[PDB]
Every structure is written in C-alpha cells, then in structure tokens.
Design an enzyme around this catalytic site. Structure first.
Site, mmCIF file in Angstrom:
data_model
loop_
_atom_site.group_PDB
_atom_site.id
_atom_site.type_symbol
_atom_site.label_atom_id
_atom_site.label_comp_id
_atom_site.label_asym_id
_atom_site.label_seq_id
_atom_site.Cartn_x
_atom_site.Cartn_y
_atom_site.Cartn_z
ATOM 1 N N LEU C 89 -78.277 57.822 -47.748
ATOM 2 C CA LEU C 89 -79.726 57.939 -47.599
ATOM 3 C C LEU C 89 -80.418 58.391 -48.876
ATOM 4 O O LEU C 89 -81.624 58.663 -48.853
ATOM 5 C CB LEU C 89 -80.111 58.885 -46.455
ATOM 6 C CG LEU C 89 -79.772 58.418 -45.042
ATOM 7 C CD1 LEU C 89 -80.046 59.526 -44.057
ATOM 8 C CD2 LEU C 89 -80.585 57.190 -44.687
ATOM 9 N N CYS C 90 -79.693 58.482 -49.990
ATOM 10 C CA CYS C 90 -80.307 58.889 -51.245
ATOM 11 C C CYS C 90 -81.155 57.784 -51.854
ATOM 12 O O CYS C 90 -81.961 58.059 -52.748
ATOM 13 C CB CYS C 90 -79.229 59.326 -52.235
ATOM 14 S SG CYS C 90 -78.334 60.809 -51.730
ATOM 15 N N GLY C 91 -80.996 56.549 -51.391
ATOM 16 C CA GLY C 91 -81.734 55.436 -51.944
ATOM 17 C C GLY C 91 -80.883 54.599 -52.873
ATOM 18 O O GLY C 91 -79.714 54.332 -52.582
#
Lengths: 232, 129, 285, 128, 128
Positions: C89-91
């Site tokens: 979910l950090c991108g």
C-alpha cells in the site's frame, strides 16, 4: 408587492421554502386527478413555476427583487422541483452550519455561493477580478485544510502560508455588523457600498494589512475601519 | 451544563474513525476520544428509569468537568447509578439545592457549585473503580 | 442499479474512505517519528564523516590501503543491498526501488560481473525469490524504529564477503526522502571511501592509540553499518510518507467515487418514483 | 570543562561539560582532562567513568570509539549499560520505554495497521 | 463425494478476498487457494459433452483426495479428459464397478476404493 412596484419603489419579496409552494402545487394536482409528472410532481410544474417568479422582474416603473429560501428534497438538486427553481434563479447564497459555529453571523459560504451577474460586462472588471481572486485564495485554503489537519502548518511551504493566512483573515473579514442586531451585540451596524467592498478587498489582497493579525477583521466594515482599529 | 457535552460529543463523532487506532494518536486526540467514549456510555440508560432534572445536571456537570476520566469506560453507567444513589441517600441537601436554583441565569455561581463539588469528591473517595 | 444496490455500494466505499483516511493520518504520525529518528541518528553518522576524512587522508599509501577500503582492480563479483517496506500500500515506492534494483543488475551483468542481493523487508525478499535471484541474506520484520543491532545480521555477512574476496564491491538501494510528496529511489556506494570531500582533514594528526591500522580496520566495519542503518531509517521515513500520499490519493478517489455513486443513486431514486407513479396512475384508470 | 558528547548510533546520551573521563581504551585505561592532546582510540567491553564536580557516573560501555580533541571529546560508543543516573534500580526512562516505542509504534500498532488491512481488504471484494 | 467439494469451494470463495490482494499469506492459504482453483477448473465443462454419474464420481474422488494437487491449473481440463479416456479404454471395469454400487450407504468401500486409486496412480505415472 406589485402595488408598491407600480409606484416605482423597489421591493424585496421573501418567499420561505419555495419548495413548499412546489409541494402544494403537486398536492393540488394530485387532488384534482391529473397525471403525475417525473417524481410524482404536477404535470404543470414549469407553467406553475412560471406563473410565479415571472412577475418578479425589473420593469421600467419599478423592480421586485426576491430572495427565496429553497429546500432541496433529499439534497437532490436534479430533483425537478429544485431544477425548475434553479431555472429561474440569478444568485445562490449557501449559508453553512460550520461557518455559523464560529461566531460569524453572515455565515455565507463563498465557494458554494455564486451569481449570474458576477461577470465583467455588468459589475465591472475590477469587481470580477477581486471576486475571482477571493474565490481562488479561498479554494486554495479549502484544498489545504486537509494538509494542515494532517501534517500541520510547518510542512506547508512558503508563498502558500501567506495565502492561507490571507484566506483566514478574509473569511474573518466577511463578518459585518448588522444594523438590526446592534441591540443584541452592542455594535453599530455598518453599510458597506459595493465599490467600497471591492476596493477594500483588492487592497487586502494586494498586500496591505498583512501585518495585521486575524483579529481586528472580525465584525468590521471597510478596510480603513480595520486599519483604524489596528492603530487604536 | 450541556453545551460542553454537546461540543465534546461532536468532537468525538468527528474522530470516530480513529477509535480503533487509539494507540498511535496525539495526546489531545486520545483524550478527546476517551472523553467521547465516557460521555457516550453516560448517555446509555435503562428502561423505565427517568432521571429528574437535578440528577441529570449533577451527573453531566461531573462528566463535563474532568472528574470521570479515572473511571474506566465500561463502569461509567455503574458510577452514575451509584452517584445518584449516594445523592439520594447521603446528600439530599445538594439535590434540593440544585433543583431550587436550576433557573438561575448563572447556575454555577451559587454555593451549589461547591456543595456539588464536595459531594463528587466524597463519593469518589469512598468508592473505587 | 436498482436504487438499493447502489446504496450498498455507497456504504462500502464510504467505509473505505473512512479506513483510508485513518491510515493516512497514522502514516503522518508514523512519518513524524520516523523523521525524528533520522535526525537523532544524524550526529552519530556525521561524526564519523569527518573522522573518515581525517583518517583516510593520513592513510594514503596503496600498500596500507587494504582490507575494506582496498579499491580492488578487475571487479568480478558485486553485491547489492535493497531495503523495502515490510507491508504494501506504499504506492509506486516498492515498484520504483525494484525497478531501480532490477535495472541496476542489468549493467552489472552486461559488464560481466556476477551479482548477489541482500534484501531488507518482505517486499524485496519476495520479489527476488520469484524472479530467481535468491537473496544470500535477508532481514524482515523490522519495526518502525529499528536499532542498529537488527541490521548486523546482514551488514556483517556483506562485509565478511568483501574481506574474504567473495564480493569485489558493495551497493545499497534505498528510497531517498527528497520531500514528503516525492520519494525517488537512490543508489549508494558502500566500499569505504577516502576523506569524504574535506572535513577538518587539515591541522589533524590523531595519536591513534591501538595503532593507525588497528583503528582503521575497526572503524570501517562500523562506518558501513552506519551507512546501512542511515539508509534503512531514511527508507522507513520515506515508506510512511509514500503510504500517506497513496492513502490521500485513495481517499480522494474514494470520495470522488461516492459523489459519482450518489449522483447515480439519485437518478435511480427518481426513476423508481416515476415507475411507481406510472403504474399506480395507470392502475387507477 | 571539556565538551563531552557520549553519542550512540540510536541517540545522543550526553552533551555537557565534564572535568575528567576515565576512558577504558583497548591498550589501557586513560584519563582525559580539559586540554588533552589529540587522540583517537578504541574502547573495549568495560565501564566508562565521568567525573562531574566529584560525582562519578559509571556508564558501562560494551565497545565503541573515542575522538579526543583539545576542546571537545566525542564517544561514539556502540552500547551503554550501567548508569548511576538510572542503572537497574531507580531506572525509569528505560522502563516501559519499549512500549513508549511500541503501543504507538510496534506492539498493538502492528495489529492496528493489520486491522486496517483486514477491514479494508474484506470490503474491497464486497464492493466488487 | 460432493460434500468436501462444496465445503472446499465455499471456503475458496470466502478466501478469494485475501487471494485477490494479499501475497504474504502462509503456505496453507496458498495451497487452499490452489485447491479451489483446481476444483473450479475441474467444473469447466465444454458443450455437448455430458459426463455420466460414474465419470463425475471418479473425477471428484480423484480431485478431493489430493491426487490432483501436483497438476497445474491450466492443464486440469486436459487432465480430466485424458483420465476419462483412460477409464473408457484402459479400465472399463472400474467404471462399471462405480456405477454398479453407487447407491450403497457407504460408497467408498475398500473394494471400490481399490482399482480406482490404482487407476489414478497408473494414469499419473504414465502421463506427466
């Protein structure tokens, strides 16, 4: 009101919850046995809304200007009742609960409130320019609300902290003493002309009053008034 | 009394999504959260148990003032019931005093304020949670 | 699209918008404490920077320029370090470093040097296992505020390979924290360096008590560990900032989707009313 | 009156001014006075002592380095143990210090962020 | 035979939420998602090719008893077709036996259990 309009006087007509007028028309149509239009509205929604709100015009002899409260069914604006109301509107004012929570009586939401007449060809180039700049700075402040809430004031960069401070000072500047509330608040009302408002806001935007804190703008009138308050 | 209660409940509602993340929060945000939880548990009421106005104002003054912070969240209702019992039996005078001057524009000004504070302090000293 | 299924969709996305808003706010709180740890570690890392400059200036002879600082000729084997967030979910941050590390191997293999990888975090560990480059040493389950003892399990192994001749050079790939909005991947050289620029290199002649070679042979293993630790802490701060940006974008997308769904639900709400007001009126006649 | 700085890779321990330091250098224990000659040593597992107006603070050091400039002293010790300030008894900062860097950092927070992953992931398919 | 089928398929449908996103799931969950995919690919039947009751029973017994775990998902339909060719040609007697005693209270009798696991093992050994 048309009797006074026929004498050349200017009349303000206040209609409370014009949506209740629409609903009354719908109920009358249902009682009469007519077929229901979209959203069970009277089939004659346009004609009924045109019989009203067409006598509210500016004529040669006089003018009737109306400020009508509108209830949006289920906040549904496409709803044919608010749609037909909007088809006959020139200016929208959106009072906001959050603005009223802070002690600003004229709790008008600048971003949500628009008007058709706010164009250069009528109100002048300067009025349009200052209104657009106020809208831009307040929109930037609204965009940066979340950044301020999450990261804080420090992380927000330069040349934008100035805009945030100016936006806070200008939203405190929309406060205005009311000549009808001078007994309750103990503050005399101030009538600010539109030209004076435009010049004061232009002089607030260009850089003047930056040293003045957020205070001294609260429940004040023109920019010279806030300058005098700051001096004293 | 109820203005602070309404404000604190609104603040708690605005932060209802952070309740399960209580560990990783600012001190003020946390404090707001357990204050909202205490107030919400206080508003919980049984059936056929109407509280007269003096009891309601006494309890909400106790809650709005930072006097129920030490009490754990699931024990707020028990604390409130025991406090009403205490006032009904041990301290009828403070209840009569609150009811007598409930119409005063500045309600907290009268000695009723100290009487009520002493009642709260005595109850919190005698009882433990 | 039956005015009740859309209500379910709006409720679901609103739950996502609430959760994603919460994840963004802790990511900022986590990032703030992650920035503090990097700042706290700064004096320790900075202190050896001038000590390296003061010491390596004194030791200039190639004969005595052995052990870690030895600039070997004809490089044959190269090892690299990658640090990745333990959780997704950090991108694009995880994809960026793996693209950087993935492309970095290409030049090394193009020039003929065999490559080995050491991974920090589960994201980097899993990607290289699937690709085929099994990591020689990995360190996962690192907390938000790890201690330098945690990275010794990998840093020692990497250095021991360099001393034994297994690795002719060492690199690290970490997410540089340029800003709270941009986290570009960064590549750094680990092989001990001569006086970093100039740091008190002049007017200095420390009477090295255990011996000039003894101090150098013991401070280089600690200096490279500090560089790895500094990169890990900087990457942790960049991870939370990247997560904050990703959650803010996700919350904005969730809120936009709710507005779109609410706009569509309202159309379905009106059409349901029109349908009923048509059947009842028709049924009346 | 020398600017002593016990700096650790985790955090700075001291930055005050100190009369004398009983440095346990690898070759042998050395004392340091405000105008000590330039020096750079290696520490070994032992106890490092600081004299502050006659008060001795025995910070236990399991290893590290030391740069002794004429005006400032830096101790890049890898680890510190015994400390008359806290030591074992009266030690408070270290007590629950892990939780101070766990409940909102590791402990609970690891699950706290896992709950966000859970409740978000489960509703992600439900919206599809 | 189909009770385990229904249970495993339901649990695979439940775990599809984790399968869509999570890549850190343990080997148990990975193998269970793999088994769900095996069953789903087993159900992918072509048109105008009905399978008699004995054939479906044999295939489902093979799949639910872990004899199909080593077969990759894309080739499971071909595996089933080849297995049916095997039973139709190599061992018609196992199909006759399965169809003959499909009504007994305990279908998996050692008699039906043998000569069926033997057929599956022979097919597995011969091909792939």
């Amino acid at each position: 009101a048309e009797y006074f309009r026929d004498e050349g006087r200017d009349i303000l007509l206040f209609i409370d919850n014009i949506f209740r007028f629409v609903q009354a028309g719908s109920e009358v149509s249902s009682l009469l046995g007519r077929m229901p239009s979209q959203v069970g509205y009277q089939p004659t929604l346009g004609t009924e809304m045109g019989e009203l709100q067409e006598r509210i015009t500016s004529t040669k002899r006089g003018s009737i200007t109306s400020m009508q409260a509108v209830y949006v069914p289920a906040d549904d604006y496409t709803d044919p009742a608010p749609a037909t109301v909007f088809s006959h509107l020139d200016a929208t004012i959106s009072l906001e609960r959050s603005i009223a929570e802070r002690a600003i009586f004229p709790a008008v939401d600048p971003l949500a409130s628009t008007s058709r007449i706010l164009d250069p060809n009528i109100v002048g180039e300067e009025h349009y320019r200052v209104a657009q700049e106020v809208k831009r700075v307040l929109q930037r402040y609204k965009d940066l609300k979340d950044i301020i809430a999450i990261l804080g004031m420090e992380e927000l960069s330069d040349e934008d902290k100035l805009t945030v401070q100016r936006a806070r000072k200008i939203e405190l500047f929309f406060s205005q003493p009311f000549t009808v509330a001078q007994q309750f608040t103990g503050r005399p009302g101030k009538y600010v002309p539109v030209k004076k408002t435009v010049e004061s806001f232009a002089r607030l935007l260009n850089g003047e009053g930056d040293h003045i804190p957020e205070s001294f703008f609260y429940m004040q009138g023109d920019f010279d008034d806030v300058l005098a308050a700051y001096e004293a | 009394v109820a203005g602070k209660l309404k404000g604190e409940l609104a603040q708690f509602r605005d932060l209802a999504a952070f309740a399960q993340f209580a560990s990783d929060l600012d001190a003020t945000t946390k404090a707001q959260i357990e204050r909202g939880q205490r107030l919400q548990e206080l508003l919980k009421q049984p059936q056929y148990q109407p509280l007269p106005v003096e009891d309601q104002v006494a309890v909400l003054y106790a809650a709005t003032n930072n006097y129920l912070d030490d009490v754990p969240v699931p024990l707020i209702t028990k604390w409130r019931d025991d406090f009403l019992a205490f006032l009904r039996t041990a301290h009828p005078e403070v209840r009569k005093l609150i009811y007598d001057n409930r119409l005063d524009r500045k309600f907290p000004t009268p000695e009723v304020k100290e009487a009520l504070e002493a009642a709260i302090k005595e109850f919190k000293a005698t009882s433990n949670y | 699209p039956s005015s009740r299924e859309i209500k379910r969709r709006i409720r679901s996305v609103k739950n996502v918008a609430q959760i994603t808003r919460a994840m963004e706010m802790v990511s900022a709180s986590k990032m703030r404490r992650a920035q503090r740890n990097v700042l706290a570690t700064r004096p320790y890392a900075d202190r050896m920077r001038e000590v390296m400059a003061n010491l390596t200036a004194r030791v200039v002879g190639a004969a005595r320029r052995g052990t870690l600082l030895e600039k070997r000729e004809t490089v044959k084997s190269v090892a690299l370090l990658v640090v990745t967030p333990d959780r997704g979910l950090c991108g694009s941050l995880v994809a960026n470093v793996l693209r950087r590390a993935g492309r970095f191997i290409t030049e090394q293999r193009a020039m003929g040097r065999t490559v080995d990888v050491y991974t920090f975090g589960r994201k980097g560990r899993d990607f290289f296992l699937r690709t085929g480059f099994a990591p020689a040493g990995e360190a996962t389950r690192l907390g938000d505020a790890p201690k330098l003892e945690a990275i010794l399990g990998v840093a020692i192994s990497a250095i021991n390979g360099f001393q034994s001749g297994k690795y002719d050079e060492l690199y690290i790939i970490y997410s540089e924290f340029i800003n709270t909005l941009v986290q570009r991947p960064a590549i750094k050289q680990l092989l001990p360096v001569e006086s970093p620029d100039i740091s008190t290199t002049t007017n200095v002649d420390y009477t090295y008590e255990p011996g000039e070679e003894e101090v150098l042979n013991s401070i280089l293993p600690r200096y490279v560990e500090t560089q790895i630790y500094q990169a890990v802490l900087e990457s942790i701060a960049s991870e939370h900032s990247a997560r904050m940006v990703a959650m803010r974008n996700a919350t904005n997308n969730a809120k936009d989707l709710v507005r779109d769904l609410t706009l569509s639900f309202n159309k379905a709400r009106q059409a349901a009313i029109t349908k009923e007001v048509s059947e009842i009126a028709s049924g009346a006649a | 009156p020398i600017h002593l700085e016990i700096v650790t890779a985790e955090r700075v321990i001291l930055s005050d001014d100190v009369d004398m330091i009983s440095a346990p250098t690898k070759d042998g224990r050395v004392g340091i006075l405000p105008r000590h000659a330039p020096l750079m040593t290696i520490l070994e597992p032992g106890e490092l002592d600081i004299i502050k107006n006659g008060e001795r603070t025995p910070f236990a050091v399991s290893g590290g380095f030391m740069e002794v400039l004429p005006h400032r002293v830096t101790i890049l010790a890898d680890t510190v143990e015994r400390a008359d300030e806290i030591d074992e008894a009266r030690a408070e900062q270290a007590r629950a210090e892990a939780e101070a860097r766990r409940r909102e950092a590791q402990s609970e927070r690891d699950m706290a962020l896992a709950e966000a992953k859970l409740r978000k992931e489960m509703v992600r398919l439900r919206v599809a």
